[PDB]
Design a protein around this nucleic acid. Structure first.
Ligand code: GNP
Ligand code: GNP
Lengths: 178, 417
RNA sequence: UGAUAUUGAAUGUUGGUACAGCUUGUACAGGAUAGGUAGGAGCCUGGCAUCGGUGGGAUACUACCCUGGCUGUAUUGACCUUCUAACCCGCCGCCCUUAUCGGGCGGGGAGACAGUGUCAGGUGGGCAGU
């Protein structure tokens, strides 16, 4: 019945366990025009990112930490197989091709789309930062200390609010479930 | 024949694409409510010389349930359901709600993306793979881009008289038509203005085919200062030009309104057969000499049209509904009839002999020119001597010599030549 | 005909709105045809439990908002049936006063109605401008 505080719930989701502390947030479609879906680099923070870099952009992609780049087309290797691993990003030139030729990213949630900051010319800066109207966000672990998830939820809430959606009218906040 | 239907949330330019498929049928406006209330029918072809098109209204969560029912019904007959969605705004929750029905529909579905009017931002065809359907396509009604590929995508799955109906709003026209072909085809609502444009359907009656069109009613010109929603009245006026039999509908509960006489003027001035019809007898009393109360009153007020037969039927209780067509078929012949040149002339000087009061106007010849309506030309020494009182006199004699019931007549006058 | 103000009380019916607390959402498959939407750190209190599973969704339990319903809380509305205190009397008595004007003070009758000020159709050659 009682709404706890942020400084109490970080110390208490220690006790709700090495598990991962995640946050649900009910948003306030009618408002799809100014919907609230997104990604931001995190403060208090293993992935396997595979890139679709084209041209010279593969040359800076092999030194940042990526596992496999490609031979400029391995969607034929994606056809009839392809246990995908963690994250798929791309570049704004072969995205159209990979989109049409690739026919295995819709119900699997890895389709490159430049609304998320994942399809850009800065592939070296993109590898290094990734490593019904609702958003899910993993802010961290059980084993993090009490001062880590406070900045994590603060950064994510400031990101949500920084993004005060248009048609701001009416309540924006409905529920925080830590 | 193949059937193709278009569905989606409103304001996606579905009717715009439907129209540039062929001609310009559905009204195109920009607003959330201004969608086609019901389903329409048409024909199409791309190297197959055989296809049909169906357009419906937008689907969301006023009246929307009936539109949803119509959209569901259209999803049945359609072979491929072109599912068009906006491109500039990405995707929406209502888009997923629409996609739910298609997911539960076991028919091939082609996905199309509108609002792609130029080459560069045409490359925005992405993230629609999450919908679970095949390759999307670009289209723009403003410029007609990407039409060939979309029609090829539709093709890869490839396997009579007209009579109208008009009147002032809320007199049961839609109820009357859907209570006559036997099948829910057009919407019925308590508020005036339920229909938004012409609805066309074909059917066979007594081994004879027929075409019936609704016109959403007509209100006064002075007080029609709406927000371009009265642009549909132009569509209603168009149907009269393509129709050849006009049914005017009056309410029996309410008395004769001044606007009804004006509406009947448009049909008469168009040279079309008219059959005056009254509906909703369930309201007012049905008794002896209540037949003549409105039967006589109509004649007193509607003098300019006297040839029109008068029919009484109530669509709600379906009383004497089957008697409407017997009137229609009879009116069909009289609007297209010719009389012999010999006989017609022999009747003319009999009339002028008993009325030798035409210097004096001279009658020399008379004959017919057109079948519909029957035009006649009389050769006189001078058409200036012709008087509108005398011109009307000739019409009555002709209308009495033969039947010529339920159709207007026009008389032309030519000089001595 | 409709709103809105002039414009009140009582009980009876009585919805809507808002805030709450409990319930429903029928997926081939799937643990009873017992929801989407963030999932994966428990029994032995009669029973039997615990991975995981053709599954797009099983939870060896962490962990939000919806949709239709049920119970409270407040808001108001819609009404009926009453009453009375505005508002209305071309009803009676008394005084202004000698007065079928008018105004006061008493009874009676109607009473939240009618009447009045700002917003829709028809009506109807009602009367104008052409
Ligand atoms: N810029 C642009 N606007 C378009 C295009 N196609 C349609 N529109 C706009 O979209 C508006 C709505 O389209 P319309 O066909 O009337 O859609 P509708 O009547 O709501 N039918 P539905 O609800 O079934 O989609 C049009 O008035 C027009 O301004 C296009 O290719 N480009
Ligand atoms: N008493 C009575 N009511 C009727 C009859 N037919 C229809 N109604 C009712 O009166 C209204 C007329 O509906 P509708 O057919 O849409 O009339 P319309 O608006 O003139 N036609 P449209 O919808 O095409 O504009 C509806 O509320 C309907 O239920 C009838 O024969 N008798």
């Amino acid at each position: 019945s009682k709404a706890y505080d942020v400084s109490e719930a970080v110390a208490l989701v220690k006790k709700t366990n090495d598990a991962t502390v995640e946050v649900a947030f009910r948003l306030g479609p009618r408002k799809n025009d100014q919907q609230i879906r997104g990604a931001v680099v995190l403060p208090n923070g293993t992935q396997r990112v595979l890139v679709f870099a084209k041209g010279e952009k593969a040359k800076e992609a092999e030194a940042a930490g990526a596992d496999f780049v490609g031979d400029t087309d391995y969607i034929n290797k994606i056809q009839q197989g392809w246990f995908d691993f963690d994250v798929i990003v791309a570049t704004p030139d072969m995205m159209g091709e990979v989109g049409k030729i690739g026919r295995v990213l819709g119900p699997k949630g890895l389709m490159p789309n430049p609304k998320t900051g994942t399809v850009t010319f800065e592939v070296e800066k993109a590898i290094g930062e990734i490593k019904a109207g609702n958003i899910h966000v993993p802010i961290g672990k059980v084993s993090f200390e009490d001062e880590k998830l406070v900045e994590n939820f603060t950064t994510m809430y400031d990101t949500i609010l920084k993004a005060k959606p248009a048609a701001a009218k009416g309540v924006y906040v409905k529920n925080v479930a830590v | 024949k193949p059937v193709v239907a278009i569905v989606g949330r409103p304001n996606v330019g579905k009717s715009t694409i439907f129209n540039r498929i062929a001609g310009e049928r559905i009204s195109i406006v920009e607003d959330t409510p201004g969608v086609t209330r019901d389903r329409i029918y048409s024909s199409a072809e791309w190297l197959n010389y055989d296809f049909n098109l169906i357009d419906t209204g937008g689907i969301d969560i006023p009246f929307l349930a009936q539109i949803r029912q119509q959209a569901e019904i259209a999803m049945d007959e359609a072979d491929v359901i072109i599912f068009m969605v906006n491109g500039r705004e990405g995707v929406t929750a209502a888009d997923e709600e629409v996609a739910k029905i298609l997911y539960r529909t076991k028919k091939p579905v082609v996905l199309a993306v509108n609002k792609l009017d130029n080459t560069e931002m045409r490359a925005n065809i992405y993230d629609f793979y999450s919908l679970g359907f095949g390759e999307p396509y670009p289209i723009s009604g403003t410029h007609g881009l990407g039409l060939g590929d979309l029609l090829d995508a539709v093709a890869e799955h490839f396997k009579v008289i007209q009579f109208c109906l008009i009147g002032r709003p809320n007199v049961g026209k839609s109820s009357l038509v859907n209570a006559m072909l036997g099948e829910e085809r057009v919407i019925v609502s308590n508020v005036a203005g339920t229909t938004r444009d012409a609805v066309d359907t074909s059917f066979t009656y007594n081994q004879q085919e027929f075409v019936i069109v609704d016109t959403a009613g007509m209100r006064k010109k002075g007080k029609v200062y709406e927000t371009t929603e009265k642009y549909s009245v132009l569509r209603a006026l168009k149907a009269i030009d393509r129709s050849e039999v006009v049914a005017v509908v009056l309410d029996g509960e309410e008395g004769i309104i001044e606007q009804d006489k004006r509406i009947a003027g448009y049909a008469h001035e168009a040279g079309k057969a008219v059959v005056i019809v009254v509906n909703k007898w369930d309201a007012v009393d049905k008794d002896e000499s209540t037949m003549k109360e409105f039967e006589e009153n109509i004649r007193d007020h509607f003098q300019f049209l006297d040839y029109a037969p008068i029919l009484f039927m109530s669509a709600l209780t379906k009383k004497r509904i089957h008697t409407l067509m017997p009137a229609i078929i009879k009116a069909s012949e009289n609007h297209s009839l010719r009389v012999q040149t010999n006989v017609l002339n022999d009747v003319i000087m009999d009339a002028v002999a008993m009325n030798p009061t035409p210097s004096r106007l001279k009658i020399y010849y008379a004959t017919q020119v057109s079948v519909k309506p029957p035009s006649f030309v009389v050769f006189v020494n001078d058409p200036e001597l012709m008087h509108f009182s005398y011109e009307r006199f000739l019409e009555n004699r002709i209308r009495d010599a033969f039947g010529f019931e339920g159709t207007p007549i026009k008389i032309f006058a030519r000089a001595r030549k």
